[PDB]
Ligand SMILES: NC(=O)c1ccc[n+]([C@@H]2O[C@H](COP(=O)([O-])OP(=O)(O)OC[C@H]3O[C@@H](n4cnc5c(N)ncnc54)[C@H](OP(=O)(O)O)[C@@H]3O)[C@@H](O)[C@H]2O)c1
Ligand SMILES: NC(=O)c1ccc[n+]([C@@H]2O[C@H](COP(=O)([O-])OP(=O)(O)OC[C@H]3O[C@@H](n4cnc5c(N)ncnc54)[C@H](OP(=O)(O)O)[C@@H]3O)[C@@H](O)[C@H]2O)c1
């Protein structure tokens with residue numbers, strides 16, 4: 060029986076309960092033995108100043124610590140240059156050569172992955188799961204510009220992804236509470252390091 | 258004057274969406290405290306003691322949240338005019354703000370003694386996005402107690418939907434499984 064590993068890729072600025080719900084749901088639905096959270100090292104620059112990678116890594120560790128089936132990888136953080144998912148999966152394939160990999164991320168990010176990165180490598184390395192919030196309307200036809208390999212892509216709606224990291228950052232900047240949006244431990248970490256209150 | 262939130266609901270189970278909503282309303286309306294009030298109840302509803310205890314577990318860590326037994330101890334059906342009359346007596350010099358799901362509050366004119374309701378408190382309805390009385394949209398209310406019960410019954414996880422402590426409470430008392 061091959062091990063089945065989720066690879067949960069995100070910038071996580073901050074990680075929030077929506078991400079955790081999504082990973083837990085996908086792990087159960089796809090019978091995953093473990094979910095490996097991989098915070099981005101250097102996410103693509105958007106028109107936005109991302110917290111230092113070490114802060115995002117620690118928040119992800121804090122958030123996932125209590126789950127026996129979650130862990131955190133530094134694979135992207137400890138690779139120089141912009142983060143690309145072919146590289147993420149090559150590294151994890153190396154560290155887990157006998158495992159079946161399932162890469163999990165937001166539906167919108169998965170569209171970007173498929174539009175820029177090489178499909179031959181991507182679908183040789185893993186299957187893909189796109190998770191989306193209520194009201195987000197994307198078809199599997201629209202997530203790619205062409206037909207995808209057989210069982211290569213699944214899409215999963217997760218109601219708790221109504222919670223967004225952007226909303227958490229704005230609230231923190233406005234000195235509005237992020238209790239219950241964001242895990243205990245992470246709330247206090249955000250505040251004492253003043254990550255968004257600047 | 259002191260400003261008190263009154264967070265009314267059946268809470269079967271209480272979940273992180275409820276906690277998010279109460280936290281936002283308390284901040285937005287500068288409430289000194291939010292009192293959670295589990296509804297009295299006779300669709301098989303979990304016994305009132307279990308719903309009360311889950312709500313206590315869920316709110317314990319917040320210095321400004323507490324839980325009242327006023328509805329479950331009254332006996333018989335819950336009417337909010339009774340809830341507010343009880344709390345008005347318990348806190349005679351407080352401005353009350355009654356908070357619950359906007360879908361519930363939509364029928365307030367059909368609730369018992371609506372005339373007295375609007376003299377006793379201000380009303381705040383919290384809703385998920387896409388939705389006298391103020392309305393507050395709360396993205397986290399995409400999480401619903403119905404979804405939590407369905408999952409638990411199907412032996413699917415409710416981690417992170419429901420607070421720590423409440424997850425394990427639900428399972429060890431087999432509330433929805435079976
Ligand atoms: N165009 C790109 O940015 C791009 C290109 C190639 C590869 N990737 C990979 O795509 C993944 C996401 O990168 P990002 O987080 O930087 O994209 P993002 O553009 O910051 O976020 C895009 C959307 O996806 C959601 N999201 C991101 N990761 C998620 C996750 N693990 N679970 C659920 N929802 C998630 C975000 O919600 P929140 O804000 O709530 O997370 C947001 O709504 C990373 O592994 C990254 O290496 C991204
Ligand atoms: N005659 C009356 O005076 C009268 C009549 C009806 C209701 N009420 C009062 O209305 C309140 C709701 O009763 P219910 O909970 O039994 O209604 P419900 O019909 O069980 O649920 C109605 C909707 O409201 C949501 N909800 C309930 N309480 C909430 C809260 N505190 N914050 C956010 N969403 C909430 C539910 O989501 P979840 O399932 O996720 O909570 C559901 O979507 C109680 O205080 C009840 O006494 C009074």
Ligand SMILES: Nc1ncnc2[nH]cnc12
Nearest residue numbers: 083125126127128414416
């Ligand atoms: N899935 C899980 N199993 C056990 N303990 C947990 N704590 C948080 N998530 C958990």
Ligand SMILES: Nc1ncnc2[nH]cnc12
Nearest residue numbers: 236238280318319320321
């Ligand atoms: N709003 C809050 N203030 C202080 N400690 C808390 N713990 C959980 N919620 C809290």
